[PDB]
Design a protein around this ligand. Structure first.
Ligand SMILES: [Ca+2]
Ligand SMILES: [Ca+2]
Ligand SMILES: [Ca+2]
Ligand SMILES: [Ca+2]
Lengths: 69, 127, 63
């Protein structure tokens, strides 16, 4: 419960997603913004819409193939 | 022949270094395993124990690193997430803790914040 | 004459493989039982929500 602008409300350009988590119940991305070392959480559904190629680049970076696990 | 024993030691070091350089080159094609944010700076140019000479990365505090894998108790493999920076050896959090213990005496916050993350996994055959 | 050139709408990506050297998607097209293989780079541009839906379905904490 804060009052400073958070996430996409900070008005910064997305640089890179650095993690994905559904621990809250909904999928969120930890988003690195350009020219800021302070990353914060955004809803994946929102990022899917606003910066789909950023989303895809993260998935391609982390994509892994595993045998019967 | 007190210096034939030292050629034996050198041959052992060289073989270990050759294998390290291979694992480093082969890490380039692996996925990123996880990201970290650093809480300390580190200058790989000044480190002396690097599995391959001159391949330790450097970073400032509050940088992000991409980790491809863990090499041993003292070293991981990955890169500083900045344009032009290439993959190299990354001091493990334990190594950084032990550097800090030394920098302390002669002249608590973990050195990396690990970013746990889900990953897309595509199932292959049980091979 | 294949992939997006068939003029069909993407329905779902069924699989992915980089075993050829480049990331390929196995693509299912609407109203066709014949899948084919498309470069990820092309699907990324032409049906990104379809690509994202594939990765989202595959996201997990444990191998
Ligand atoms: Ca969450
Ligand atoms: Ca400094
Ligand atoms: Ca670069
Ligand atoms: Ca396939």
């Amino acid at each position: 419960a804060a009052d400073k602008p958070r996430g996409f409300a900070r008005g910064l350009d997305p640089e890179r997603i650095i993690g994905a988590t559904d621990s809250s119940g909904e999928l969120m991305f930890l988003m690195k913004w350009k020219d800021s070392d302070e990353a914060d959480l955004v809803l994946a559904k929102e990022a899917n819409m606003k910066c789909p190629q950023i989303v895809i680049a993260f998935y391609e970076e982390r994509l892994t193939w595993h045998s019967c696990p | 022949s007190d210096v034939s024993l030292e050629e034996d030691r050198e041959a052992i070091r060289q073989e270990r270094e050759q294998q390290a350089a291979i694992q480093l080159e082969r890490a380039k094609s692996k996925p990123v395993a996880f990201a970290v944010k650093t809480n300390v700076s580190y200058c790989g140019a000044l480190d002396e124990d690097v599995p391959v000479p001159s391949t330790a990365i450097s970073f400032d505090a509050k940088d992000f690193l991409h980790i491809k894998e863990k090499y041993n108790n003292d070293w991981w493999i990955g890169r500083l997430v900045k344009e032009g920076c290439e993959i190299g050896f990354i001091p493990s959090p334990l190594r950084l803790e032990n550097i800090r213990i030394q920098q302390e005496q002669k002249r608590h916050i973990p050195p990396y914040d690990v970013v746990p993350s889900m990953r897309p996994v595509v199932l292959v055959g049980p091979s």
